[model samples]
Target chain A: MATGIVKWFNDAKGFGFITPDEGGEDLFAHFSAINMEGFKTLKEGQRVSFDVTTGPKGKQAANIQAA
Target chain B: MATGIVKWFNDAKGFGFITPDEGGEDLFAHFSAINMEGFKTLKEGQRVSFDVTTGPKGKQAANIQAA
Candidate 1:
């Protein structure tokens, strides 16, 4: 699991990118990946945690949630 | 915030207890206290962190989350 902050999100599109605390390129994320339900939303700078999985394409971030 | 492991949970009743890692009586908790949404479930020995409030009812754990 990795920790970070909700760098940005667009509720209208239900997606965004997270800035990892350790620093690097923003990790793409979606509301569907969140552990919450209904009207998913995230604020800039909100603390979050997620899991990283290496796929054929590259590292994928999932299981996003507020820290 | 304090850390602990899920001691027991009654999914049907939407309640449970968390044994603080620091040691003592298990702190009472409820599904509503969880920081997630939909189909809330906790497994025995799941790592979690929460805030403990001492009120007239004793210690109640809130803001519980996977640690």
Candidate 2:
């Protein structure tokens, strides 16, 4: 698992991006990947920890939860 | 923040309990509180980290994420 910050989110689209704390890569994210309740209220720059997974094209996406 | 293990869960109910690694209290958990993807498949004794929050009845519930 890795830690990161919410870089941006599009509430209507239910998608977002996360900037890893270790500074390797920014990952694509989706609402379905957010496990914590109240996460729907998350804003840009919030701290979180996440697990990385490979999506359709091997692109990394994060499954984020509040830290 | 705290670390714990999934002690039990009732998938249909979307509720569960976690035993803290620091050995304090066993907190209540709900599916909505899980932050990591693939958490729906969590089994007993899996390691996780979480932020604690006060619920409606003032009970402690964990918002869990993969550690």
Candidate 3:
């Protein structure tokens, strides 16, 4: 899994952006892609690991797990 | 199981409101309460069954399943 840092997230929107530590464009992160119990959310600057996939717009984060 | 109809749902927010078929105030519906596989969601007017529980604001739906 690629490690990344949450750039920003909106709880109401249930989505955010994650900046890969390996240096690349920010990946779109959807709450549905989060793999955890309870309401899925990511805080700003939180360390995380997630798989990347191509979305209609750009890169998307999937199978996200907090570090 | 108590049956209800989805008043509205916001997929991004992962929550919705369900109007009990038996007649009552709308119950808050969280995606976590949906007892189905894959990304959980409820369309407007979707028939469903769920248990009621008290939340901080008001009645909440739990263990929801489509009718």
Chain B TM-scores of the candidates: 0.51, 0.51, 0.52
TM-score of 2: 0.31
Find the candidate with the highest TM-score and give its number: 1
Q: What CA root-mean-square deviation does each model show from the true structure?
A: 19.4, 17.8, 20.3
What would the TM-score be for candidate 3 when compared with the true structure?
Answer: 0.29
lDDT of 2 by residue, B1-67 (tens): 4444445656576654554456555455555554544333322222333333444433222443443
Give the per-residue lDDT of model 3 (tens digit) for A1-67: 3544455666676655555456655555554544333324332222233333454434433443332
Q: TM-score for all predictions?
A: 0.32, 0.31, 0.29
Better of 1 and 2 by DockQ: 2
lDDT of 3 at A55: 41
Give the range of the ten consecutive residues with the poorest summed lDDT in model 1 chain B.
B38-47
Each candidate's clash count: 0, 2, 0
Model 3, B24-56: lDDT tens digits are 554555554443332243222222233334444
> What is the DockQ score, from 0 to 1, of model 1?
0.03
Q: List the residue pairs that clash in candidate 3.
A: none
Interface RMSD of each: 18.1, 17.0, 18.5
How displaced is residue B39 in candidate 3, in Å?
A: 16
Q: Please, what is the whole-model Cα lDDT of each candidate in the order they appear?
A: 0.42, 0.43, 0.43
Candidate number of the best DockQ: 2
